[PDB]
Curated annotation (Swiss-Prot), chain B:
This is Glutamate receptor 2. Belongs to the glutamate-gated ion channel (TC 1.A.10.1) family. GRIA2 subfamily. The record marks R60 as: Interaction with the cone snail toxin Con-ikot-ikot. Palmitoylated. Depalmitoylated upon L-glutamate stimulation. Ubiquitinated by RNF167, leading to its degradation. It comes from Rattus norvegicus. The gene is Gria2.
Length: 95, 130, 50, 50
């Protein structure tokens, strides 16, 4: 995962031979695409939409319930243990 | 039919799945591949996507004073335009022309997307030892 | 020449010339410091979940 | 406080009359200043430092 903002400000651009005919046209084209949100759209298409990771949530921070819950269960082992042992000793010892 | 030079860098320009069964511009797919079609539509021209030979971006060997990569193929008339993640640098702006940035970026930090969960059993009990 | 926070827009690039951006920006969100606290009557229980 | 990243990508620039003599010079000057980190320095001076 990426953390914090960028350290510097760079930028990619369309390169055209010095003094070319496509020079001004392409320049305006890039500005037009960005204003139409077409550039942002394209990025979303290949970075996030086409991405494989939208799953990788919780927060706020809560209690430990897990380990505690193990205690519940094992604790229950004690329960049923008292249960059967007492049972067969009552009915079986006495009876 | 304009010659568009570009570099193979995901996810800007990548080889399509069945690229062996395809030809021309249909062979490639990516951010720049789509950006090319868009630019060509607003500027009105046909183009042929071509991958730079040496597979470099633009640099300038101090000794030979020769440009390499896409920036090179532009200065020496090999291509008509460069549509790729080419950084806009002063050293390049002197020899070629850069359109306004189509994507602002910078240097970032990458760490291991941390696992915040390590539940045990009795770590419940761990404050005391066996 | 114009040296100010002048936005580089298409409508302007047609009449004048804009140098490369000397400061990239955008639209952001402004909120208020979330420093508040309420004691209520439900909060107490909460360290122990429902 | 500002929260989250920007919603869009904009940018300010130095404006010069179409077909001016200061046109190329200023353009390169801006690029030179940014690479020398002088632009970032100026912002820090007036935004955070000051």
């Amino acid at each position: 995962m990426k953390v914090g903002g960028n350290l510097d400000s760079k930028g990619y651009g369309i390169a055209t031979p010095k003094g070319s005919s496509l020079g001004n046209a392409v320049n305006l084209a890039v500005l037009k695409l960005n204003e139409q949100g077409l550039l942002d759209k394209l990025k979303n298409k290949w970075w996030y939409d086409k991405g494989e990771c939208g799953s990788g949530k919780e927060k706020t921070s809560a209690l430990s319930l897990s380990n505690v819950a193990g205690v519940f269960y094992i604790l229950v082992g004690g329960l049923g243990l008292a249960m059967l042992v007492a049972l067969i000793e009552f009915c079986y010892k006495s009876r | 039919t304009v010659v568009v030079t570009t570099i193979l860098e995901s996810p800007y320009v990548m080889m399509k799945k069945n690229h062996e069964m395809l030809e021309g511009n249909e062979r490639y797919e990516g951010y720049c591949v789509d950006l090319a079609a868009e630019i060509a539509k607003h500027c009105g021209f046909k183009y042929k996507l071509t991958i730079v030979g040496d597979g470099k971006y633009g640099a300038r060997d101090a000794d030979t004073k020769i440009w390499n990569g896409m920036v090179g193929e532009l200065v020496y008339g090999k291509a008509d335009i460069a549509i790729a993640p080419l950084t806009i640098t002063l050293v390049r702006e002197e020899v070629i022309d850069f359109s306004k940035p189509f994507m602002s970026l910078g240097i970032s930090i990458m760490i291991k997307k941390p696992q915040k969960s390590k539940p045990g059993v009795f770590s419940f009990l761990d404050p005391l030892a066996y």
